[PDB]
Structures are given as structure tokens and as C-alpha cells.
Amino acid sequence: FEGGQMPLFQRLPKRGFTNINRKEYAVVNLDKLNGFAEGTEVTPELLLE
Amino acid sequence: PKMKTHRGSAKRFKKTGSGKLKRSHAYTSHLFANKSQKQKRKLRKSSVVSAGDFKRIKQMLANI
RNA sequence: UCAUAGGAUAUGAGAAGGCAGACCCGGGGAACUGAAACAUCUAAGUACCCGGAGGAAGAGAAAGCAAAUGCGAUUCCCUGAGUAGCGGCGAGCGAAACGGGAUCAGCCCAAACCAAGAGGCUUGCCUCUUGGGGUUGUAGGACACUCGAACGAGGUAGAUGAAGAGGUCUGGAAAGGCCCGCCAUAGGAGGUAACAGCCCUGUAGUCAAAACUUCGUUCGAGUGGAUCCUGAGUACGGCGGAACACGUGAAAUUCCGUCGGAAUCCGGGAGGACCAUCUCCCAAGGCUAAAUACUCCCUAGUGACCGAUAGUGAACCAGUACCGUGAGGGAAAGGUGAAAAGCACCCCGGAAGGGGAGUGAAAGAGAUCCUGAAACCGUGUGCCUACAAGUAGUCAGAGCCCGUUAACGGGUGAUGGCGUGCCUUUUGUAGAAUGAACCGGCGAGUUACGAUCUCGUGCAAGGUUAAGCAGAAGAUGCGGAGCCGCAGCGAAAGCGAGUCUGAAUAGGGCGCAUGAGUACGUGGUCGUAGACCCGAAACCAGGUGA
RNA sequence: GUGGGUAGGGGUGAAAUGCCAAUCGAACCUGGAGAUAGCUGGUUCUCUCCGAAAUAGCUUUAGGGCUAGCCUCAAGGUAAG
């Protein structure tokens, strides 16, 4: 509330939509990959453990 | 009773990195013939909320 | 006076009415309040009224969830998530599936056709009762081929149950102090003239039932697919409403009232308007326990719960006295002593009440009777006071009196200086502004769930469990579903230490590059809850009164 | 006089807002209900460090409220003042 002066949020406009479809991918950088040994196979199931 | 997010604000704001909130500009809905092109171009861009208003609405956007 | 209401008789552990101020279904259904007004909305399908059973009820075996080398009845707990959404796009409201748990039961019909008996005949079109006939979606079935005892455990009454009047001291009284013993599957609890494992009742273990009463053991198929069936005034639509988190909106889905109104497996319904392909499924018929909710009750127990202005209104003859016509409102009041041993007897007195005597550890303990504060009321007294006006004190101070937690002491103070109480609210109060008659008790910023920040911890590019299952209502173990970070930008597709804008390899915005967060605890503050405590006039629902 | 009827988004009224159990411009009792109160009052132990404002803007706003100014505590820039 702002004492009847209309609050900032209501003064400001609305922005765009959001949708159900959305592929958020678990990010992993190369710096993390160094922790594995030489010559290994790295796959998501292994990354989980 | 866990806190309720203020949906009327959540539909307007967005929390950028470093914890600041991004906003659009007002006065951009339905009068444009009474505004020179310069300010129209300027208001087209997005801005960020002020320090005092940020301090005031800290609570209302607790859960992003 | 065909025949029906109607009437008469008999037979029915048949209904009613109550209840636990709880829980579950429904039918009906507010305003206060929030929105800082107010009508959509909220409060809230809450309060309240009504009907209905249960010990639990509702729900239920897919016309489902979901889009994958798929799951397989419902119910409830964490999580999803304050997300997707809804909303005078305000105030606010607000899910579900996937995932992890407790629990685990699937079944029975109508229809087809067979059999009969069921008569009306207009020879099966309908009977009605059985059975075969059957309960099904990458369909199934008709139809032809295929086989009311004795026993264990409790519950209600109970039984048995170890070890010291140990000595000594004080004391009215040992359970207490000192010095010594013993039992302990028992050191639970209470009482015992003070604080007891060994004094008593009992406690740990071990037993017990004539009679009722609650729990566990005996007394069908597969192959074929001509024909037939697979829930009609039903689904669904228009109109107007309601529930779905969803306010008519893109408005799917469910139900209600009016009207209209399908198809039958080459068939139908759903996958959030709607169409097509695909995927899943078979409504318009029923039953179904456990997980779950709640205590008027009973049994055994627990409390960093109260201790007589508390704690139930009610420790005590309390929903009583009392008030009200009535609905209804609604108090106060615990404590002699260990044992009454509760005061023989005498004196004043009419008694009451006293003084003695006696009991007892205490009579100052005597019927509010353990302790007995203050206000208040009195009696003696050391100092002062009748020529002085005083927020009454303080600082000086003679005189008089007393002699201490011994110290540059105590009481009183003739006389001088200074000086308008406390609290709130105010620019401002001695204020002729407000509140207190005085004393005592009671009497106001907490708790839960989230958020954020500081501080402290264990780990750290990782941190961390929730529900739940074991576990003395505990810790601890398991439980990786889930949540926050390590990457950001954009509305989004999407790209990525870059990304957005833009024709731009230009400029500019955003964290770059200048790497700690997480779990928990205290503390500050915030948000939802009555939220810091007292106070409205008034509104709405149900009743009581002429 | 006795026995009865009319019950509160009502009843009665030769009409005053009269009466309806000493209450009536809408009776009484319980519940929603600890209604709400931007209003009035009050809010309890002590010492120490620092220590304001009564202003601007906007407000169905004027004795209220939000932001800014002014206060305080902590971590930093450090020498800007």
C-alpha cells in the first residue's frame, strides 16, 4: 500500500506470457568435467550418482 | 500458512541476477500521437526499479 | 352392488424418541469484515436451521491418469507450489498428475438365447420364478465346437510377592544426622506422629475364573466369429443456474430446472473451444473391508501443565443460591490437631464472652481453626507544638533523648535558605485539561507456519532430507521422492559466458570476468492467523415474550 | 374481572414515532464474535553509548498512510568531508 497513491506495481504495465512447454536443461560446464579420470565414458545416469 | 506471492506484481516484475528486479515503463498503452518519437523509443526499453521501492516491496516478491 | 376405494378382524423384539456441545453425508444458507469507500468478489458454502446412518462415514475397480520400449480400484500423509492458473488482473483465491509412503479385494447384475409353467391367443409379441447366461475393450458374451461344537489368548472380582522395631544422637513423634547390615527381575506410587528399597498397602516376576464377554482352528476351460446382445426420453444440445482453483471467459469437465433430442460395434466417450490422425477407455445398474476422521465414555499411565482472584462456571451438596415471566444469565465459599486428646472442674456473667485449671510439641491451636502482610482502628509513651499561614520535603541547624550490622551513630527537631505532587496528552501543564478514595491480588507485544537480515555452528561447489518404517510419546538408523545453489539473457522459440535489442561482426541493458551456498539454533523485523490489551453504536441467523 | 388471538425485514395504533414486560426511528436471549474501530485510554526491573522530527512529494488526503530528509547498529571505500 502507498496511502491511496496508486502502488508502483499497478502503475506499471504487464509483460508477456509463460507456457507449459519448457526444456530447462541441467547446465554443466567443462570445468566440472575435469573431475573424471582419463578415457572415461560420461553419461547422465553416471552424472546422477 | 506459508506466504502468498503477490500475483499482480509477479505478472509484472522479474528478478535478474544480483537480486535486482527488472520492469517496463509506464505511459506506453494507448496514447502515442501526443508523444514525440524520442520518448516513445526511450520507454520501449526495459528498466529497473528504484532503491526505495525495492526496499518497500522486498517482501512481496520473496518466492521469485 | 361387474369392481375399486372405503369398512371390519387377526398376525408383526416394525417406527417413534433420545443421544457425544465431536466426526460424515446431504437439503437450506447470512451479515459483520477485507477491498483502507462499495455493488463483481471476500467473509464462506463458514456460522446457523433441517433430514439421514455409521462406528467410522463418503469414495471406489477406469467411457481413468498420461504421451512412454506406459501405468493400472478407491482413500489418506510429504512433495509438487504459493507453481500453472483464476481475479473490479484489485483485494485476494488457488489445484492436479508424475514421484516417495501407509493399506490392499475384487466382485454381482440387465441384455441376449435354453428350459419349462405362466393365456392373453392376433400361436409367442408380453408374462413372471427359477436356473443354465453373463459380466467383457490390441473387445466380450450369446451361438457351434472343451470339464451350527470343542480348542489358545485376554477382559471383567482377585491370589502370592525379598530385605533392618540394627545400634546410637536430637526430638512430641525418626522415615532425619553418625556408625553398621541386607534385598533387589522388586530403588513404581501412596500412607506411616518429620525426608523409608528393607514399617504397611503394595511394586518386579509368577498364578488364578463358577458366570458373561472379544479375538484364531473344525462344518471350471480354449478354438471359430453367419446371426443376435452388450444399461433411451439415456448421452448430448439450446435456454437459466450451480460445483469444478477456473467470476462466461478460449471455457474443457460434473449436476441441476424447462424444452429439444442421438448411435448400437462398419458403434460410442475422453485427451481443457473446435476439427482431423493417433493414443486410452466402454458411461447411461449395484456391492465392496484397511489405510483416514472424531472422544460423552471406560482401563492404565505421562506432563521443564495450575495450585484456591489460579485450574473446569463448579476442589466445598454448582449449573446450586440468586436474577429474569422466558429463552437465559449466573456467583461466593479449600486448610484446628498426629490423634478430638475439642476444653473435666471453679469464679464473673442471664446468656454470649471471659479469667483460671487440664489436654497437647504449640490454647498466642479453641470451630475462617496452619502463616496472618497492608490499608484501617486503638492504648502507652522519648522529642516537638497555642503570633503562625507553606506540594509538607530537602540542606543548614541549637536544644533534648537513646546508644548501632561501630560509624566522620539513631530519634526528635526551635530557627534560616530553596522549593507549584504523580501520570497521560500537548508547541505549552503547578495547572482552573484528563485518571487514581486507600491497601492487597490479577491485568497487556506471545505462539504456530513461511519470509528476510545479523550472529554461531557442520560441511563445503555442494548442502539437505520430508512423509514414512524401526525405535523408553526420545535420540539414533534407514528413507534421495523432493528443495536451494554451482549461469545467465530473452516475452518466447531458443542460445549460452554470453545473451537481448537491432540490418550491425556498431552501440546500449542485463550477472560477465571481481567462485559460496546450503541444513539447523538464537536474536531483529515482516506476512497469515483475534496478533498488543480494554471499548463501540450497529449488522446477520435461530429462538422467548401481548 | 376471567379465558383467548395478533411476534419483531413484524404486531398494534381515534396517528404521538405512540406501545409491544421500568428497554423501541425498529424488543429481549444465545451464537457469527475476541465483529471492525485510520479514534480515546493504558502497556509493569535497572544502568550505559548515540540520539531526532513536527519538513518535501502524492494520497476521497488533511489528527491517517507510502517514499525522500533527519536518527541508530553493522560491513566496507578509505581520506573522499
Add this chain to the structure above:
RNA sequence: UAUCCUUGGGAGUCAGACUGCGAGUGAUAAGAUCCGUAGUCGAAAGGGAAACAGCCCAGACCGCCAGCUAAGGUCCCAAAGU
């Protein structure tokens, strides 16, 4: 001389008054109202102006039967110069 700025946690304040000085309104009236500027009070006791918040001097951490002063004052009340 050492107070300044950034971030973060927690506030109260939105009724101000008077006295100089420069103005408005008022009748250059008001202990009037509204501004700017400085001070005190607000939130500040002490000494002075008899008594007094805002006028003057001047800031209380406590004790002392010490001294020097500021405004004001020295005939008595009443300290100090008839």
C-alpha cells in the same frame, strides 16, 4: 579539523511555538496566519529578568564546609563599593 560516501538491519517524526532580521495577508493590529534566515524550547537543568519554555549568560558523569569568571549586581530585605 576529522567527518564524509556505498550497501545492509530497526525506527519515530507529517499538531510545532516564541525571539531577532527580510517579506506577504491584515489597518506595516494582534501572544494573528504563512514564508526565508539564525537561535532557544520542543528534548535543557543551573545564575539573571520579582514570580515566567521560548529574553540574557550558560550545558548538569558523581563527591568536596576549594578558587576564578559570564549576564546581572554591591543602602536593607539579599553576597558584594553609602
Add this chain to the structure above:
RNA sequence: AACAGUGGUAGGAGAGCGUUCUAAGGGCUGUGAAGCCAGACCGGAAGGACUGGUGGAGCGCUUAGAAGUGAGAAUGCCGGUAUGAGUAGCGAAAGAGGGGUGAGAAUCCCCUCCACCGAAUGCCUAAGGUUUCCUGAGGAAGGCUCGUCCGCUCAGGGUUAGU
């Protein structure tokens, strides 16, 4: 050691004091705890000791924990007691006297006059009251005084219907 500072409302920050219970360690207590009462003691404060009297069974200290944790005001609630104050009031009214009883008599009983009502202050009887009616005892409370008295207390007794 030096130097500087130490008025303060709304406010912010830090230090503490006390209270009730809970754990661990210690021990105080009928050779008298708690509580209360009185002292001329100690600390910067909230406060804490010590010595007596009362009282007659429980209770401090130490470290930490959790709070129904601290009252002087709310025309606060409850209980008790003041003030006004020995003041107002003692509720329309004719009694007077002699005996009686009695601890006590204006007030109770008896007697003699006097006085008041008399379409009532008389005589019956409703609603209603529910033992208050009668006899014998008592006088703490009720009785606006007293009271030997009664519509009060105690023990008994009392209401007879075919009309």
C-alpha cells in the same frame, strides 16, 4: 599510562538485576527451611547479604534451559477498610397512668380512662401467597430504636363435605 568525553523526549545499540519451573554438580534444613516482622550492613542500579523475633517443613548456591517473568495509573476487575460522620435518615397517625412478668420494660401482658375509622382502618370471599395459622419455649441474626416481645428461630399440633 596519556588524551578526550559522559543533559536528554520519540527512537536505535549494548550491558546486566530479579522471579517460577527444568537438568547436571555441590549441600542447607526440627541444632528450625519457606514466608512474615525489625535493624544503624554491602554493591554503580536493578538488588544481595548478615543478626534478632515470628513460623513450624521444606530450600538456596553453581552452569545452562524454557517462560503465564517484574504494575502506579487503563472513570480497569475482585476482596477488604477509610472519608463525609456520630452527620442525614429512623417511612402520614394520641396516647395517659396503675399493676404483672422479668437480669434488664416508653415499646411485652392485664386494668381504667382518652383518642381514630366506621360505603371502612368493619364483616365474608377471589386471584395470589404456601404453614406465615394454634400451643409451649428462645432472643444471635430480621424488626430503620428497645424488646422479656412475633408475620423471626426451635418442638409439637391443626384443614373431616352425596348437597
Add this chain to the structure above:
RNA sequence: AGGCCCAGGCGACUGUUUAGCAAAAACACAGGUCUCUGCGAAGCCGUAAGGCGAAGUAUAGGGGCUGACGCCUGCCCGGUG
């Protein structure tokens, strides 16, 4: 167990009302007027069954207004109904 007389407003009169400030010029009144209603009248209570109206029938009922009696009650239908 009457004071009386003269005049004047208001109200014809008897009556009724603000229990508990106001008893009046306010209310009522008989009278007058307008209008509704053909009887399962209209109007009214109730949702509806049921009623009152009324075991009544436009010389009767409901509603509005004015208020004995005497003389009278003029103009405007533009507006609202």
C-alpha cells in the same frame, strides 16, 4: 355542595393521544366529495393450502381527501400522473 360579566382567535359538539415533560388549534367524528369493485368483487395476510372482506352483493364493501350547520367552492389538461 357554581365566582360572574363583556369581547375576540382556533376547533362545530361528547370523545381520543405523546404510560414517564407537551391533553392542544393535533387525532376521531357524523356530513360531503372523488375513485375502485358484477362477486373464486376489489383490497388485504399467506408462497400455498387457507382465509378476512362476508354466511355481505353497488341504498354493499375498499381506498384518497375535507371535516356539524348556513352561503359557496372561479380559471388553466401546457407539464406529471
Add this chain to the structure above:
RNA sequence: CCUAAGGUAGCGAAAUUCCUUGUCGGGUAAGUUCCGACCCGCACGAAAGGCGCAACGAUCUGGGCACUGUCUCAACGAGAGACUCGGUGAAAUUAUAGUACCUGUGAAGAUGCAGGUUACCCGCGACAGGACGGAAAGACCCCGUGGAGCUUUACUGCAGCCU
């Protein structure tokens, strides 16, 4: 010029008249009242009825006779309170009080402040000038983004009725 029509009869400083105690006459020594009359009716008027009206009125207004303590202007007397004694015995209020008068100051009106002036201690009977006396959190006024009742061509709805 305008209206749809422009107030006729009756009455008129009236329950209606601010100017206003209208102007004139009566009544009285004197009349803002009263009665009668005039009309310049701010702002009478015909069913919100107009104008009179015998009778009536705890109605309102003016005048007159009788009457008197209403008065000049008070006096006395009777009874109940008050007053003294005896018995019994409250209440509103109350920050503590050893509670003077002037002038002045002050939140502008002092008992408590300043400077003076007066005042031995304590009671009994009366007065109400003050203690802005007590009773009542002002019924007046103002403000709550308070409440309630009522009204309408305020808004939005609803019952009823009509189609």
C-alpha cells in the same frame, strides 16, 4: 412581451406583515398587547377548502365587578423538620495536605508561584462567593472514507403486477 391559464367571490399588518410599536378611532393617566376600520396581501383564497356561525372548551388573547397578604410591607400564632439529650446509623465525593487577603505572573481566571498585608489553638448554629464544586467520557458545533431511520426523476437490485 409572455403563458396552458394569468387569483373571481369572500377575507386581509391575520396562528400568515420583515417595513412594523403600519395609519386612524376606542378602551387606559399612560397600551410594542387587544378590539374596530383602511389596503402597498415581501409571502390569503376557495375541498391542504373560503367566509360566518348558536352551543360547547381544565383551549389561547384583551377588558370589567367581587375578592383578597399577589403587592406597599411585612407581623404574630399552631404543627413537622431543623436545635440539646438518649438508641440506631448511611450516601454521593475523595492525589497527599499544617488548605488567608490584595496586586502581579503564568496554558492569558491562583489556596498552594512572586512582593507585600493581615491572621493565637479547637469547636457549635447559619450563608452559599470560590475550590472553573458533584452528578453525567457534551445531547450544541466539528471530524470519523462510523452507525441507524426516512425521502427521490441518486446507483444497482428484489417482491408484486402487466405482456
Add this chain to the structure above:
RNA sequence: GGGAUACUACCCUGGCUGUAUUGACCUUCUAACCCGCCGCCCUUAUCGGGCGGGGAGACAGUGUCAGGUGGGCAGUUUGACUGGGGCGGUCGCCUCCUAAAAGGUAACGGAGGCGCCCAAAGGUUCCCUCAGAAUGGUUGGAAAUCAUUCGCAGAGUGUAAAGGCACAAGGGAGCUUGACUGCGAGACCUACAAGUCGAGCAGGGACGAAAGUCGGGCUUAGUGAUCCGGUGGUUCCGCAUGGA
């Protein structure tokens, strides 16, 4: 005369008859529905209900929907400032003074204006110069239109005041649409919301030979949030998939 349409079978240049369907006026009845009409029975019953008769009658009543009317009834609103309220006046923006030689600074203080206008009154290149006065000149004067002289600004600048403008920002002509798109280093102003200026870069232009100017008026007013909805473009999403 244009195709004079003379032996498919034209649509009717739009006409009607005989045939199944729809609305109103008509009258009927069984036949619904109604009957606070009558006779009998249930039945010692003025309730209702069975029959019969009679009257009405597809109307009415009732159910759903729709429109009108509707203070009879219900929930609400009816602003603030204010030298107390009410009434009066005002409410946003722009210019000046009050304003105390930076900025800022109130009053129901003192004076005015705005809710537009301009396809040229913009941009650019190029060229000048005013108002008033005196004197001659007719229709024609006090001023029409001419010629000389004087003339620092008195005149103009779209409009209201101030600032500033004759090296034009005033006046005239030609061309033109920068009255552009993407932006924007910095800075002013600021509680927030917003408001203002801005060099410089890229793409394309306009003007001019070039330099170089142009991102609207000579500077300051001429204008409003969000929500919702309408319209155009979309290399965005669009609930199993493709579309919507």
C-alpha cells in the same frame, strides 16, 4: 436495324389452378385442465373424493425463459481545501511578481493564459530590414496604393508572460518532407512514477558545388497511469500430434 432468338428444352418476361406442410377469426366437443354450481355415495362431515349432470374451456392456472413497470422492499454512494462548518470559490498544466542578486520556497497572495494551431506558420539554399513621423501625390480623408528623407528596434516573432532575436530566431523566393529508423557516451531534474537536453555511430535520404544543416515550430504550456477491448505486422507460443 443489333444476334429477327425457324424442328436442345431456356431462367418463368413471373402468372394460376388441383397436392403435404405454417397464423390469425370462427364453433364444437369429448378430451384434457378448471368449477368457493347441483343430485347420490364414501359419511351422524359446508374438508376432499368417486360417480352423474351442468357451466366454462385449449383459455385460465401452473413450470422455464423473455420484456415492461416497480422506494412497496433491500445493499450502498452522495469528495477534499476551508483563519469553525454550510453557501460562495478552487482542484491538472504554462508565464511573471511576491522570492530576501545560486537553486528551492506558502497563503481562499497579486496579474494572465492552455485542453490548440501550422502541409506550411516545418527542413534546407539563397536574398533583404522594420513601426512611426515629415513632405509632394486625385478617386482618397487621419489612415488604401506611390516617391524622398529621418528612423537600434518603438515593429514583428501563430497564441499568454518572460528570456532572447536585425551576423536573424523578423520578411521573400526555389527545392524538398529529418514533422526519419535503429540508437545513444554523458548530464540536468528528481521520493517514486515520470519529465528534459545530448554530442557521437550505422541505414537511407532532403537541401545545397562544397563546407555543412536537417531526429518538427524561436524557447518554455496545448495533455493523463494501469486494466480491458479494437485494428495492422509478426522469422514467438500455441495443453497427445497437425491445425486452429
